[PDB]
């Protein structure tokens, strides 16, 4: 799918930031193993040419530029144009892809160009040259740097930073007075920002930086406005925070890439997360096969509740049934948490009387991805695991029959699963005692009998209100009565709290101002919501020392990394919708 | 379920209904000799994958055919085989009508064994005019056959009621058959000669006949 | 190997078929048969 690009521009309101304030790029970026990992992500990342789409987006934003003193847009259409190092490529395009649509007027938001200047050895249309050294060229109002970049070394990157200073000087000489130019920040260095600050901040009236990110890297794009026009342009606190955000995000993406499996490698089963499939031929289930039973039990232990597809095909004179699934690290944790090796009943298998054709293995089971509801459940699960801590008794509200949280929870600390609907899992194999209560998740009086250390109410609070037909405030008061039964020092409850002003997301959920509730058409359900102030006051009354913290799921892709651990592709729009719902449905940490 | 290398379902279907037996009549003989185009008995058999006829499905009669197929010399073309067979049937039909007037016995009983042997003779173009009186079933096909002593021992041999020979082929292999996996197996039904078995009226007397008979 | 293949096919489809004959008088001469059923005499070919 599409990549995420981060664009920032000079803001006078923003407090000025110093070159010193900006963080240095990590040395690991030039590590060879790190480069191989980034290459692996590039292989695992499926998208259209990053460069062409990036040029179109940057051009549209450039066309959005307005000069404030003028009261008119900074960009004037048909101004002299410069494209640095246009590249034909070995592809045989013969020019930058972005250029063709712009020439054909196929790019929305692009005013017709009076002229287009082409440069670059690879591009046949562009002047065939290398921008490594100074050369004679025309003066153009607009400059776009697309030159292929070759650097002697990362240590030479300091020399490379000086060459980039030379590149900027060349851009200035090429540009007309009052002109503008664009240079991609292929390498970001603190010295580089310092140099631009020392000699170039005055030269250009305005500036903007956009990082189009399709894959994890620190490359940036620098935009220069009012070139040849004196300016006081300087770094700003907001811009610096954006840079810090970029570095943190890159670090997280790199760490995920470091855990990435080999692309289309031969699977020997070594991977903790890897396909699990075995073939059974002419199996006899009339009595206890045992050997077949043992193999099935082992496969189940490997799957750890993973979905497994079975095909029975006849070859070499005999029908053969193959079960196919994928092992996982979390499933492996569940397997390690089994105290003993369990056995299974094959009556359903004996019941099976059908033939399935053979299939060829592929690492990815399917390309569907995760539903926004599924994604939010993952965000909540990741948050709970982060909330998982040493030596803690646990209580879970609205627990499902699957109870995946138990697999997530380490064996040493005890946990409690509670819901109206009975669970479907078996607890005999667990290495440590696990507690599941067959009582309504909203049922009462069991708490008075139960001793309390820590309690969780995830993805069940709205359902509880719907079941008891209570208002969110009323449900919360009944919950406070349960809390009176409850003794947990630390309590987290998923809550429908509209911390943000109510805003509906089209296609997913409908929120009612008249009745404080969230109705989700995507899941086709309606659950009420309540005012935060009243709940906070009630909580302080319940415990004078009680401290409740709003939980920030957003700003973190680690729950998305958990999906990657599940080999699940992630989509930004659904994640954003889930984040908006979380702003109106935060988890209360108390 | 599994016995030996074979696994079978414990649930089974056992039917309680069987079709009632029907006796053969002279009109039935005439209709079969007529071999109506609307329901010609012969059925072409096609290799399943090809769907191309490689064999012939065989019904009743022609169950008296035991000679080498090389002697028979069947036409390769299925349609040509049908045309030649139809001409032979028409001529044989005039001959049968001449031998016995239809008015005298429209549905009279005839010896099925005799009918099959006559089919074999006509196919090998041998004279069954001598056996034509024998063709009509008088009372017992077994009794009538026990009375008859004419013809070669090879053409047909009955020790009293007991008679051991091969019945007509269930399937006829055609020229196209290649013994392909897609080709259906005829289980030796196509074989002109597969085995000789002794037919007799009573099992106990048959066993007494077989007291020292090779087993 | 056309000739050899044809020869093999002929042998399979044309090898001669043997038969047997009943012989001997049990009431007076009894049975001289040793490894075969009484009165049975093997014949290299089927008899018509």
From Swiss-Prot, chain C:
Source organism, top-level taxon: Viruses
Signal peptide range: none
Compartmental location: Virion
Subunit architecture: Homodecamer; each decamer is made up of two conformers of VP2, called VP2A and VP2B. 12 homodecamers assemble to form an icosahedral capsid. Interacts with protein mu-NS; in viral inclusions.
Family label: Belongs to the turreted BTV-fold inner capsid family.
Function of the protein: Inner capsid protein that self-assembles to form an icosahedral capsid with a T=2 symmetry, which consists of 120 copies of VP2, with channels at each of its five-fold vertices. This capsid constitutes the innermost concentric layer of the viral mature particle. Displays NTPase, RNA 5'-triphosphatase (RTPase) and RNA helicase activities and probably participates in transcription of the viral genome. Helicase activity might be involved in unwinding or reannealing dsRNA during RNA synthesis. RTPase enzymatic activity represents the first step in RNA capping, which yields a 5'-diphosphorylated plus-strand RNA.
Protein name listed in UniProt: Inner capsid protein lambda-1
